[model samples]
Target: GSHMYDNLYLHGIEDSEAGSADSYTSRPSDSDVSLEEDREAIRQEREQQAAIQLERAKSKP
Candidate 1:
């Protein structure tokens, strides 16, 4: 199970890092605002996943 376990381990690390700094090329102001809203939605999903990850961690070695 080490390999499967390591998959979650790496995913957890990446999630924290990937949660920030989504790059966008220079674009219209309205489009940027929409993207920001989308990012907020993504952050909420990440928060939910983070909770799920912790639950899994409790069951893991």
Candidate 2:
């Protein structure tokens, strides 16, 4: 949830456009695979559900 672009502060010098700068800091994007892996897992679950439905149709009286 933290990004380097967040909570940034820049102070301009008396005669310069740039001065002190600070950043909120950021964590590695790969620290966790929950975001991507969770989606894939959900997709797989949906596929499984579809397969069950197909099987039920084939066995219907």
Candidate 3:
């Protein structure tokens, strides 16, 4: 169940803390963008999963 946040944690920062201040040559602005992108991607995935479950339940007896 673990994911991208693990990478940040392994690198010595929480996800919120990771995407800032140029972690090992990564830029601050771009890092913020990366996290925002990550957040949206997760949101989309979760929404997709929920819709799948809804459809499955609708088809059940």
Candidate 4:
């Protein structure tokens, strides 16, 4: 959920800069799908809970 930026600058005076220069790098973004799965699981759990509650309420004392 976080982003990173890299600042690169040319040191010596060169006609052509090919590779990356000395710079500050940050962490990469995460591509974890666990959150989505967790949300879906929670939703299913709540639905199940609701169904159980509804059934219990409908039952005669």
TM-score of each: 0.29, 0.24, 0.23, 0.23
Residue 23, model 2, lDDT: 29
- State the lDDT of candidate 3 residue by residue for 1-61, as single tens digits: 3333323222222232232222231223233224323465455543343333344445435
- Alpha-carbon RMSD, candidate 1: 13.0
How does candidate 3 score on lDDT? Answer: 0.33
Write the residue-wise lDDT of candidate 4 on 1-61 in tens digits.
2111111111221222111222321123322222222245355543343333344455466
Clashes of 1: 0
Clashes within 3 Å, all models in order: 0, 0, 0, 0
lDDT tens string, model 2, 1-61?
A: 3221111111111111111132211122212112222245354543343344344455436
Best by TM-score: 1
Instruction: Locate the minimum summed-lDDT window of 10 residues in model 3.
Output: 5-14
Candidate 3 Cα misplacement greater than 4 A, ranges: 1-40, 59-61
- Superposed by TM-score, candidate 1 places the C-alpha of residue 31 at a distance from the truth, in angstroms, of 30
Candidate 2: residue 6 Cα off by (Å)? 46
* Model 1, position 39: C-alpha lDDT score: 53
Compared with the true structure, all predictions reach lDDT values of: 0.34, 0.26, 0.33, 0.27
Q: Residue by residue across 1-61, what tens digits does model 1's lDDT show?
A: 2122222232333332222223322222111112222256456654554454565567645
Cα RMSD (angstroms) for every candidate in the order listed: 13.0, 23.8, 14.1, 25.2
